[PDB]
């Protein structure tokens, strides 16, 4: 993920914004420059371009089962090829097991030593979620979502909320409520030998108050916020024992009434830092905490569109895939001691960036959801090129399984190889939105339409709409050629010309009417087949990306006149007449960002936090660690090629 | 069996299923791809297939006793071959022990008529069952069991049950009677010696609640579902005695009636799972348990037939050799201690990957079952020639061996090495379907006569039908040419074009036919008989898999005249129309199945769970591993050699 | 260990010092010498300087069972391993003593399900502080031990103590109490087989009195001084049984009240340490003695802090986890004869060193005492790059095991091979130190603000402050480049030069200040924040000690600004300005340690004695040696290499 970030050290540094937010959303500002070079001469504009994010969502879980994994395991005891070696870790057992007779072996392998169940990504899950509800909890800004009331005088749009915003909690209660449901049965178990077949952690490095809060997250959580982090989800285990040294009861207590919520107020971000940085070093549990950053981040938020059709995609849910928590690593003290046993690189040198800097997870999540967006469309143009391919051969398949859907769309919107789960049967997914003809409907108010192609006062979308500027990932490359993703592009003259003189493709008139929107000239574009009723591209005045529009997706029609280029009442650099001959210039568009930060409202700046490759040097003081992996473990990387994407190895 | 079940998937993505039932069945939903690649000309099509399946059978069950193992002593107590070296066993009590020269001469003198009859296999039968039903009791689910009401809207169907499911029970009642059936005459053992030749079990390890369990679950077993599973079967031991540090009186009080029926409730899946693996791996009983599971699998569920006449083969019911119950391991204390002697290789594996996973049985039983039911149905249709150059006596050259039925008929499907059952005189059999004139009465109520072999107001079959499709075992090579059961076929020319049409022989027809349903046209045929109500391909939806047209089950006919290519009601991808010599172009196919999640009913989804073979290494401490097998004991695989399928080593 | 205090000074002179209390605490005076060595010119200034220590401490203890070591018995009833050869004890009973078959046949019996946990290291403990309590009782300066009265004539700072010496006892009471606590259920065993599973402890070469002394000090044992190796401990054992030629009645008057105080004095400290000495070498109990050694000197006692902020470090409290009291050696009395097996080569030197003289204990604690606080602080100013030019990830490396905690410190310290606890699960933590963010409220009554971080009433420490100096140990090797911690340094040209004086880097400027101070010139400096209320290099007298300035504690600062250099009040030896380039000199110093000798309080002086390895070899007959060690058990030792940090063999 690092990399991703990092777009392979370019510039040999990447950056990263805190997680912040008002009222479930925060907008991200930015400001660039757009050249103009014609008449052997530069024209040029500044202009503050806005991106708003909201956090609001509600997932599906699917607390299934998973595939174990023992990856943090004495190398002793491990094997690259044998594997988990049962005789060896039965038979250190017998040497200091005070059971008698031959039967130790039996003994040990009825009760304990033949689950070999070890995975505690869900409980990172719950931990690393904590600590972002606790960062927006003394941020001041922990409170219920609410989806922006979009309005332009035109058809708006407005979707409902699960709480109030106003009835949300101003402070971060406890995931679970006292005297009201269950709880798991815990217990110190610092037995030599198991005595009962259960989940078994070992949190012997970690305080008295970080112990209490794994051990009370342990429990089940509630939601009470419309955050798509505040999904439920229920206890991770119903019994389960930690080996720790002293007896803690805080959370016991806390049960019945004996302590008060005054005495048992949720920790702060840096305890929660403390108690996770301690487990997973403990533990040895690099790769599993890789992929819980992988899947939070998946979840973390969505971009609210500017357009009214882009709500489609906004509106969706997605499934997680979490696998049933289980542990067994408390079963046994020696299975710790030694080197870790074939801990993936990346996910150890994700680990110290994370460690180092722990907003890495957020800014991946902020740059994932716009790209994922993106890709969507993206695929969906590209399998039909335009509407100019005959066949099927774009070979989408790394689409087809909900494992590979994010990274496939990642790959898709970027040339950057995405990042592999890590693991199996884990992913989220919008099923619905498999296919590229994905139509969806919209809840709609009573707005007069204006060429909106209202349906039954139910705006209906096919598809993914392209929802949010690429501005943080603005060297996307996402076509082959010149485009606004790329940067710079240079505008051609007609194709030919004719009793209105306008005949352009849909690409290269969408370059030109984003060029014209920029400099502040709106254009009109007619074609009198399908139109539905729009004459103008659809622009934003707080975000001046223009939104391509649905005839270039269709690919039905080739080309597109347009007639008339009309001059907005706010002008800006002045332009020749481009849509006639012998007044058209070859003027050429570059654009370059000047400040780009990310703000909750306009209160409280939140300057960015420079990240560079410097700190990425792992801790490799007894970690035996392995660059190359295998495409079993889905520990790779979907790359796409000039055919399409495949999942390729990293080589 | 484990190398069978990780073969079917070649070693990757060995998926396996969670056992689910909806009334007695559930169905096994896929998405799988399948290509169509022309003149460079790729094209696709995605589709859910649906093949699925029922646990309600009605098996009978002969409970005859058979060989008497052994394989479960220390090393100095068996001889080179299985005879108990019962000298060496009285050695072993002079010298080690210190008894009266008297006591032990006279036990000497009374154990020269003894009868060292050891067989678990019934036992270990009559648990596994218990465990299963006790599973999808708590899942909430169980109850008597239907069969599907299936119906064409041309012709009703509906096979009789014993029991239907509304007077059926909700949970599950225990196997015996409240004092109505006698109970076996238990005792408790604890003494060094043997005192009467009645079989002795060592049960010490186990709880009280499980030797409870195990005690009363002795007794006559009354079958109260149509379960499959829920076979009758009497007490496995009028008398016993169990070796146990203490008495056990809890059950002894529900046998008499002073305990009713809340204060005894049946114990948790957990713990009776955790009890089989006390007893197996205590007596050291791996080599029968891995015959018990495979006589599970083998006799668990059958596939519910799409077509009409597929019912035919739910009517069959199966015929079982279980050999009766034998204990010697509980003779004497000594016996079950030192190092296990002779236990095959495959069944520790097996037992360790059983374990680590209970649902690897279920997988392989609904594998099982698929493969049985297409290698009947292939067999059949391979006696004719179809598809097969050689004329082998596929009729009664390696099929009249019952151990060896099941197993020839998965290597004529598959021809993978069939997995033996390990025992000899067990097996599961279907006299009746030896003969390939095996008729049935199917009892129909006709809606109108949509076209079929009706007579005698109910229809009759030809050998064995077709219940399902190949869709949980894909890549089957039954046929040694391409084909759809293969993973891809490459339709041919025909052998002669005609002013009608083309004619076609009688396997490419049949594969052109297939493709074609797949693709979305219908294709009707002409044949120089008239034995059938309706010139089509059968196809029915839900799995889209035509059906070998039964006119070529019998021979003398090699060409088909096909004609009549035409779209159906809905269409996928457009093709040539493939007969006449203009528009017939080299199509070629490719299919592969993406996704597959089983799910009971139409609420509850069972996801596709994973196995980390890498991690279910077996405990192979303490014991004496033995690779290579007896034929005798049916110890071996069986695999479809181009001379004919037969017993081989795994050499 | 004896290899670690020997390596400290290098093999010459191998001081130790007898252990002496006033009120809890005292001070170790020494006489050490630093020349000046510059153009030819070398000069020298001899200085006493005073490290005192402290007594007093609060630990918490976790009496939680763990490991059971069984490396004592002979070698026939052991295996390769630490499995108990129970088969061989129970032949070795047939054959040499002559039992009737049924007594062996029942016993056999009832061993199959017994505990063979056995752990003395809470015994050895228990005697071991019980020891030391009655030599610092018949000393005649045993009280209940008071922090140090410490100020500075601007805060006067006094940390509330639990027990006040006034009302503290002066003569040693007994741990139990006369009846009011419930006494363990011991009692006499004399057969050679077992009869209960209650441990059995050997104890016949110990005479009447030590067996009265051992039997009731196994009692719950009560905190009743502010010592820190005064901690609170319960009863071991709530049964035993101790094998004895005779019953011992006398303890049991005095338990039942029969006899009184004076009949019953507490044994002399020659007594108690030759009853340790015959229950350790009879039931050759070296390794569990070197364990509980370890925890002793880890446990013992923390240096008071002369400046004001170093009382944070006495505010902690240490953890420890003291495994369960276990006993298998009285159950059978062959058990300890024949050759001992699986005893480590350092505890058998270890054991013979510490009963030639045991004051070895006491010099190592106050060792490792100075050596945790300076790797603590140390660890902590090296993560920010202070003198290290590889920013090794020291935050978490290797201070996460707990068995480790201790010795990554001294590594980090010295950069000696520290010595591993020897047992798995037994280690002294403090877990709020973990972190670098570790603060503190201690409670000051300020006097006036001579400036001081003061917050709140009471001012706050960072991470761990400074509370020794190293001269107890003087030629540490802390950091890789020479420094005052080394024995000598090159004070070198300023990196610039300026009008009003020289800016200096992160080390050497503390170099040539703490050069200074030792000179006679008061050193002042301006650092680019404002975070103090003094630019000064504070240096408490008494050890003419410069502490590292907190402003190098953070990072983003490599370059100081260093002026107003100038004469004390006093002055020693005459240097150049060392700051304009004009009156710099290559300024050589070099520092010896010649005298040490502490004295408790003001008026006992005990000279600091020597001890002659020459004549402490082990006794090394009868007893089977091994020189490696399991790494499991934590038997090796840790050395600080140039990559970290790591656990290592000592081959």
Same mark, same amino acid.
């Given at each position: ?530 139109? %539905? ?73 939140? %300057? ?44």
């Amino acid at each position: 993920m690092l990399r991703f970030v990092t777009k392979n050290s370019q510039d040999k540094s990447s950056d990263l914004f805190s997680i912040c937010s008002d009222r479930g959303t925060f907008v991200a500002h930015n400001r660039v420059r757009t050249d103009f070079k014609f008449d052997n001469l530069v024209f040029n504009r500044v202009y503050g371009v806005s991106q708003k994010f909201t956090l609001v969502g509600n997932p599906t879980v699917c607390f299934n089962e998973g595939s174990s994994y023992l990856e943090g395991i004495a190398k002793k005891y491990l094997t690259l090829d044998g594997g988990l070696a049962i005789d060896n870790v039965l038979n250190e057992l017998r040497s200091t097991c005070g059971i008698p007779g031959n039967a130790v072996a039996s003994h040990a392998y009825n009760i304990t030593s033949w689950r070999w169940y070890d995975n505690h990504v869900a409980l990172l899950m719950n931990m690393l979620r904590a600590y972002h509800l606790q960062v927006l909890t003394e941020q001041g800004q922990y409170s219920a979502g609410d989806i922006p009331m979009y309005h332009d005088g035109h058809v708006k749009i407005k979707l409902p909320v699960t709480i109030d915003d106003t009835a949300g909690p101003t402070q971060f209660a406890w995931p679970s409520d006292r005297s009201t449901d269950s709880y798991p049965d815990w217990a110190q178990f610092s037995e030599s030998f198991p005595s009962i077949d259960v989940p078994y952690l070992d949190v012997r490095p970690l305080t008295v108050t970080e112990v209490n809060f794994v051990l009370m997250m342990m429990s089940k959580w509630h939601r009470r916020t419309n955050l798509a982090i505040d999904y439920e989800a229920p206890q991770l285990a119903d019994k389960f024992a930690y080996r720790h040294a002293l007896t803690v009861q805080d959370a016991d207590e806390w049960i019945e009434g004996d302590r008060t919520d005054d005495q048992f107020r949720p920790p702060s971000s840096k305890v929660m830092l403390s108690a996770l940085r301690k487990y997973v070093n403990h533990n040895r549990l690099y790769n599993q905490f890789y992929t819980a950053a992988q899947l939070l981040a998946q979840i973390m938020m969505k971009p609210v569109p500017n357009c009214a059709e882009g709500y489609a995609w906004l509106m969706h849910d997605a499934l997680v895939n979490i696998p049933k928590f289980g542990s067994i690593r408390g079963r046994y003290p020696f299975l710790l001691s030694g080197d870790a046993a074939l801990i993936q690189a990346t996910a150890l040198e994700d680990w110290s960036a994370i460690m180092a800097k722990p907003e890495l997870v957020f800014t991946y999540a902020m740059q994932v959801s716009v790209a994922l967006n993106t890709g969507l469309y993206l695929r969906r143009v590209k399998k039909t090129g335009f509407g100019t391919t005959i066949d099927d051969s774009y070979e989408d398949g790394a689409f087809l399984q909900p494992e590979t859907f994010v990274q496939a769309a990642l790959a898709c919107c970027t040339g950057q190889d995405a990042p592999l789960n890590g693991m199996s049967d884990v992913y989220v997914t919008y099923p619905d939105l498999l296919e590229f003809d994905a139509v969806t409907q919209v809840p709609i108010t009573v707005i007069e339409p204006a060429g909106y192609n209202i349906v039954d006062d139910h705006l209906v979308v096919v598809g993914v709409p392209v929802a949010c500027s690429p501005y943080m990932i603005f060297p996307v490359a996402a076509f082959d050629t010149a485009n606004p993703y790329c940067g710079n592009f240079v505008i051609k003259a007609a194709n030919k010309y004719l009793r209105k003189g306008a005949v352009y493709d849909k690409l290269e008139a969408w370059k030109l009417a984003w060029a014209l929107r920029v400099a502040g000239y709106d254009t009109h574009f007619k074609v009198y087949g399908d139109t %539905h009723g729009l004459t103008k591209f659809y622009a934003d005045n707080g975000d001046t990306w223009t939104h391509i529009p649905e005839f270039v997706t269709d690919g039905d029609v080739m080309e597109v006149f347009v007639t008339a280029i009309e001059r907005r009442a706010r002008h800006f650099v002045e332009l020749p007449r481009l849509n006639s001959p012998a007044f058209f210039r070859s003027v050429e568009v570059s654009t370059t960002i000047y400040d780009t930060h990310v703000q909750a409202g306009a209160h409280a700046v939140y %300057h960015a936090s420079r990240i560079n490759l410097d700190y990425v040097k792992p801790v490799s003081t007894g970690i035996q660690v392995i660059n190359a992996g295998e495409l079993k473990n889905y520990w790779g990387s979907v790359r796409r090629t000039q055919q399409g994407l495949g999942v390729v190895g990293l080589t």
